[PDB]
Amino acid sequence: PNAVELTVENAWFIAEMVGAGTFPWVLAITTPYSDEAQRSAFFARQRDELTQLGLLSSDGVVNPAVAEWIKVVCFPERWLDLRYVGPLLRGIVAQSAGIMFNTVVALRNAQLVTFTAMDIDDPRALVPVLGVGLSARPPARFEEFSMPMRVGARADERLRSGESLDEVLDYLGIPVSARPVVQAVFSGPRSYVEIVAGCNRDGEHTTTDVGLSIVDTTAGRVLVSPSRAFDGEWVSTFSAGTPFATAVAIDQLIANLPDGQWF
Ligand SMILES: [Pt+2]
Ligand SMILES: [Pt+2]
Ligand SMILES: [Pt+2]
Ligand SMILES: [Pt+2]
Ligand SMILES: [Pt+2]
Ligand SMILES: [Pt+2]
Ligand SMILES: [Pt+2]
């Protein structure tokens, strides 16, 4: 009742019916067909499918709850873009303070898309949400450390030259006690999410340059938190993916925005 699963084509149709051109880019939900010819068949098929789903009334009215959820996602005031990688999983956490539950989560997995209305009041409530595309690993245990992008680039060069990961972890000086975790961060199997925060305050559509990554490895969950140093270069802190640390990192990420104070 607070959630609906749809086809991506179903979703596109309702977006069109509510007046929204398109969905947030992160979802990659583009026009289903090609011609003026495909458009007409698509529309016939979708009117029919939404009706058989009770989401479109005989009188042509979009279910008011699903309509609102799709509008929140399409016309968001504040959002987190979620890009999941692992062996197309894309999400967005959207809030549209005006119209709306105060959050709508959209999760697109291949040809389907779920929309879930939630009440989120603190960043800790987001940990199970962001975790949907990960693999439910417990937190990794290791001493937090940082790596610069230039240092990472030199490591990559060495690795490309055929140096062992072991030799490259020595070059970086990773303590032996931390290597099970660090060698897992840089090996499969793994799953991760790249998160960017956005807002539409001025009607101007700012996103964080920073993007936070959460990575589930064989040695547990790790949080990677980049920051841009004064000379521009990215520097990342790698830390244990506890729910607490994750919550703080999500707060921190959002803090970069003008909006500033989502909670
Ligand atoms: Pt037909
Ligand atoms: Pt079709
Ligand atoms: Pt409502
Ligand atoms: Pt892979
Ligand atoms: Pt990096
Ligand atoms: Pt070289
Ligand atoms: Pt760089």
Annotate 131-143 with DSSP letters as a single string: GGGS--PPBP-S-
| Other CB atoms within 10 A of residue 231 CB | 6
Beta-strand relationship, 112-118 and 145-148: unpaired
Q: How far apart are CA 26 and CA 195, in angstroms?
A: 10
**CB-CB contact of 45 with 10 (8 Å):** no
C-alpha count within 13 angstroms, C-beta hemisphere, residue 90: 16
**In total, how many domains does the chain have?**
1
**Which residue's entry shows tokens 């998160």?**
195
How many angstroms separate the alpha carbon of residue 172 from the centre of ligand 5?
Answer: 13
Residue environment code for 78-87, b if the CB has 16+ CB neighbours within 10 A, otherwise e: bbbbbbbeee
C-alpha count within 13 angstroms, C-beta hemisphere, residue 131: 19
Which method resolved this structure?
A: X-ray
Beta-strand relationship, 103-109 and 78-85: unpaired
* Amino acid, res. 253: L
Q: Which of 125, 152, 139, 130 is nearest to 223 (CA)?
A: 139
**CB-CB contact of 126 with 120 (8 Å):** yes
Q: How far apart are CA 92 and CA 152, in angstroms?
A: 29
The bound ligand whose nearest atom lies closest to the alpha carbon of 41 is 1
**CB-CB contact of 110 with 135 (8 Å):** no
How many angstroms separate the alpha carbon of residue 201 from the centre of ligand 5?
Answer: 30
How many angstroms separate the alpha carbon of residue 164 from the centre of ligand 7?
Answer: 23
Domain that holds residue 241: 1-263
How many angstroms separate the alpha carbon of residue 209 from the centre of ligand 3?
Answer: 34
**CB-CB contact of 86 with 135 (8 Å):** yes
**CB-CB contact of 48 with 54 (8 Å):** no
**CB-CB contact of 14 with 62 (8 Å):** yes
Packing angle of the helix pair 8-18, 64-74 (nearest 10 deg): 90
**CB-CB contact of 28 with 90 (8 Å):** yes
Q: How far apart are CA 233 and CA 212, in angstroms?
A: 16
How many angstroms separate the alpha carbon of residue 80 from the centre of ligand 7?
Answer: 24
Q: What is the biggest distance separating any 2 CA atoms in the chain, rounded to whole angstroms? A: 69
What token pair was written down for 195?
Answer: 């998160």
33 CB-contact burial (10 Å; exposed 0-12 / middle 13-18 / buried 19+): middle
| Residues whose CB is less than 8 angstroms from the CB of residue 122 and which lie 6 or more positions away in sequence, other chains included | 247, 263
What's phi and psi for 91, nearest 5 deg? -140, 165
Q: How far apart are CA 169 and CA 179, in angstroms?
A: 8
The DSSP secondary structure of the chain, one letter per residue, reads --EEEEEHHHHHHHHHHHT-----GGG----S--SHHHHHHHHHHHHHHHHHTTSB-TT-PBPHHHHHHHHHHHS-SEEEEEEEE---EEEEEEE-TTT---EEEEEEETTEEEEEEE---SGGGGHHHHGGGS--PPBP-S--EEEEHHHHHHHHHHHHHT--HHHHHHHHT--GGGHHHHHHHTSSS-EEEEEEEEE-SSS---B-S--EEEEEETTEEEEEEEEE-TTS-EEEEEEE--HHHHHHHHHHHHHTSSS----
Q: What residues are neighbours of ligand 5 (ion), with CB under 5 Å?
A: 152
* Amino acid, res. 118: M
Q: What does each C-alpha distance from 122 to 78, 116, 256 come to in angstroms?
A: 14, 17, 17
Resolution (A): 1.8
Residues in the chain: 263
Pick left, alpha or beta for residue 39 (phi over 0 → left; psi -120 to 50 → alpha; otherwise beta).
alpha
The bound ligand whose nearest atom lies closest to the alpha carbon of 42 is 2
What token pair was written down for 135?
Answer: 């693999």
